[PDB]
């Protein structure tokens, strides 16, 4: 409607250090969280009930992502590796080795035969899920890579970096197809394609989110009012109800904007530290949010629209 009405339903406690990332499983049943405590935890998406802990990394984890069938997770760690996990058994199926520094971000493609990763070593790597081998190393950026994401059919990858650039890569060739540059190039702390693949949402460390038309190469919308100068905060498109943009903020709030008019429609209060990560449920109007060291909780919020 005019505005959603997200209200706190559950607070999920259990990580002993900052939460780095939260993601809903594509089937809607689960939430996964990753933490600086080196753990992944699985929670019920609808009741917030703790399910299990998945362990194995030697250092903190910056990101987690689900496979399309909701059976696998990939995690990205400061230990310079990714791990692929069988969620039900908890087994580490593969350890993806090859980055020379912290691995910061990760995602499966829609077919889930590939994983993309970005690292502090300034490269983007494409991996084969079955063999666990690296297929390509792209010399993508001249500073740490902050996010990597496949488009809807897996043909393209978007990457962002502290070097101020967003780049679009051909998955099969590894060719850089596009570099997005605005009037200015502050660090880019997050990027993802819109669900329809026509747009890219990019966060920058000047308290600003930008919606780019991908093939026309131009910034169409801008979202402000939040605080984001230090951390790589996730952002989302919310599509189950009203069309929103959702993001954490360094003032401890979750911000929801009307995608089209660009106005703040709600600010969610409850966290006691930086909201680093938000996720939108695939079928219900539910948002998960997660905070840094002084808070350590995950919250599940639900709206009537």
């Amino acid at each position: 409607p005019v505005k959603p009405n997200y209200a706190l339903k559950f607070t999920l406690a259990g990580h002993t250090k900052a939460v780095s990332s939260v993601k809903f499983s594509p089937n809607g049943e689960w939430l996964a969280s990753s933490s600086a405590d080196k753990l992944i935890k699985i929670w019920g998406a609808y009741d917030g009930k703790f399910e299990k802990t998945i362990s194995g990394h030697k250092l903190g984890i910056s990101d987690v992502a689900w496979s399309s069938d909701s059976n696998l997770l990939v995690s990205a760690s400061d230990d310079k590796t990714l791990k692929i996990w069988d969620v039900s058994s908890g087994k580490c199926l593969k350890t993806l080795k090859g980055h020379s520094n912290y691995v910061f971000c990760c995602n499966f493609n829609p077919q889930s035969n590939l994983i993309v990763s970005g690292s502090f070593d300034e490269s983007v790597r494409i991996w084969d899920v079955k063999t666990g081998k690296c297929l390509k190393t792209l010399p993508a950026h001249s500073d740490p890579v902050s996010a990597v994401h496949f488009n809807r059919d897996g043909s393209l990858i978007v990457s962002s970096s502290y070097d101020g650039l967003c780049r679009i890569w051909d998955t099969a060739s590894g060719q850089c197809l596009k570099t997005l540059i605005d009037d200015d190039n502050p660090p880019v702390s997050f990027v993802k394609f819109s669900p329809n693949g026509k747009y890219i949402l990019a966060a920058t460390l000047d308290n600003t989110l930008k919606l780019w038309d991908y093939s026309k190469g131009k910034c169409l919308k801008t979202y402000t009012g939040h605080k984001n100068e230090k951390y790589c905060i996730f952002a989302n498109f919310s599509v189950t109800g009203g069309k929103w943009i959702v993001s954490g903020s360094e003032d401890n709030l979750v911000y929801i904007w009307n995608l089209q008019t660009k106005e703040i429609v709600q600010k969610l209060q409850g966290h006691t530290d930086v909201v680093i990560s938000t996720a939108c449920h695939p079928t219900e109007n539910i948002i998960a949010s997660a905070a840094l060291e002084n808070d350590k909780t995950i919250k599940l919020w639900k709206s009537d629209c």
Binding site: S35, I61, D78
Partner: peptide
């Protein structure tokens, strides 16, 4: 990590 304060 992403959380590094």
């Amino acid at each position: 990590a992403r959380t590094a304060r």
